[PDB]
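Hi all, posting the design record for the shared folder.

TITLE: backbone redesign
STEP: 1 of 1
STRUCTURE INPUT:
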């Protein structure tokens, strides 16, 4: 029975290696990575791989791994797939921990923009969780943390992390991680999966996929949102993505809104993440 080596980048930046039978479905690998991570609240997570166009795709747990990675390496990342709007409601501290590690990468990468003060506050909770109480012996006036807090670091930011870390004396790791999440969850781009697109006129927009629906970003002064319950049908055709909206009260007809994606694979990918968000946040 022939086995394929799998390499998975974990949220702490380390690498998990295992073997699965070459006909294995995605769920087999996911279950192995989740066991390794001691993670029981698996529904919020998944594995990503890079396609031949170097685009991130979600590994479908129901489909054969080989029919997704196709010509590419069996190389994956472990990631948050569904960002919970209220992380306090997760049943385990270890779930909140992985969510924090994902959000730290979202912030450092610039996927989750964040004010100076919120970067420093998030940083201060990370430092408290990982080192415990502020110690003046480890940090002089010239201290720079090993921790990555932001896409660009300044001495001012390092200073403010320390000033806020001082305030958290006595705080336990689960407590600091819960505070991290109570602040992170409020950021306007929290758990927003962004896709480049054009509207029906050819104007360049971003489409955001998240718990609260499909968001349209254009010019930063005109932001439309379609809550999931309003969306009856999501479809794609060639390079086009379509959402069918419920008729408003006393309106005779549903309305269908159309967008242009870079290519057919980009349209299908946006369709799949929308259907998955629609199902997940209908049930959560
Ligand atoms: C098992 N049911 C949960 C809510 C879902 S729905 C979806 C698209 N993925 C998951 C993990």
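Okay, here is what came back for every position:
SEQUENCE:
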């Amino acid at each position: 029975p022939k086995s394929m080596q799998c390499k998975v980048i974990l949220l702490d930046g380390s690498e998990y290696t295992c073997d699965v039978e070459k006909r294995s479905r995605g769920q087999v690998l996911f279950d192995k990575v989740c066991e390794h991570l001691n993670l029981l609240e698996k529904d919020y997570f998944g594995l990503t791989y890079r396609d031949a166009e170097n685009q991130k795709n979600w590994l479908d747990p129901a489909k054969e791994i080989k029919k997704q990675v196709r010509s590419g390496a069996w190389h994956f990342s472990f990631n948050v797939k569904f960002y919970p709007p209220d992380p306090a409601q997760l049943s385990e501290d270890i779930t909140r921990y992985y969510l924090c590690l994902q959000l730290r990468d979202d912030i450092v990468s610039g996927r989750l923009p964040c004010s100076f003060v919120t970067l420093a506050l998030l940083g201060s909770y990370t430092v408290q969780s990982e080192l415990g109480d502020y110690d003046p012996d480890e940090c002089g006036s010239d201290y720079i943390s090993e921790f990555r807090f932001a896409p660009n670091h300044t001495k001012e930011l390092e200073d403010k992390v320390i000033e806020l870390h001082k305030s958290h004396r006595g705080m336990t790791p689960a407590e600091a991680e819960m505070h991290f999440l109570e602040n992170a969850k409020k950021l306007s781009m929290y758990g927003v999966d962004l896709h480049h697109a054009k509207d029906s006129e050819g104007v360049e927009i971003m489409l955001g996929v998240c718990a609260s629906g499909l968001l349209i970003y254009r010019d930063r002064l005109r932001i439309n949102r379609f809550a999931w319950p309003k969306v009856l049908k999501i479809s794609y055709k060639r390079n086009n993505f379509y959402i069918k909206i419920r008729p408003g009260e006393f309106e005779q007809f549903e309305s269908t809104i159309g967008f242009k994606l870079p290519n057919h694979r980009a349209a299908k990918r946006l369709w799949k993440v929308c259907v998955e968000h629609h199902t997940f946040f209908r049930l959560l």
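COMMENT: Residues 264-283 form the longest helix (20 residues).
Let me know if anyone wants the other runs.
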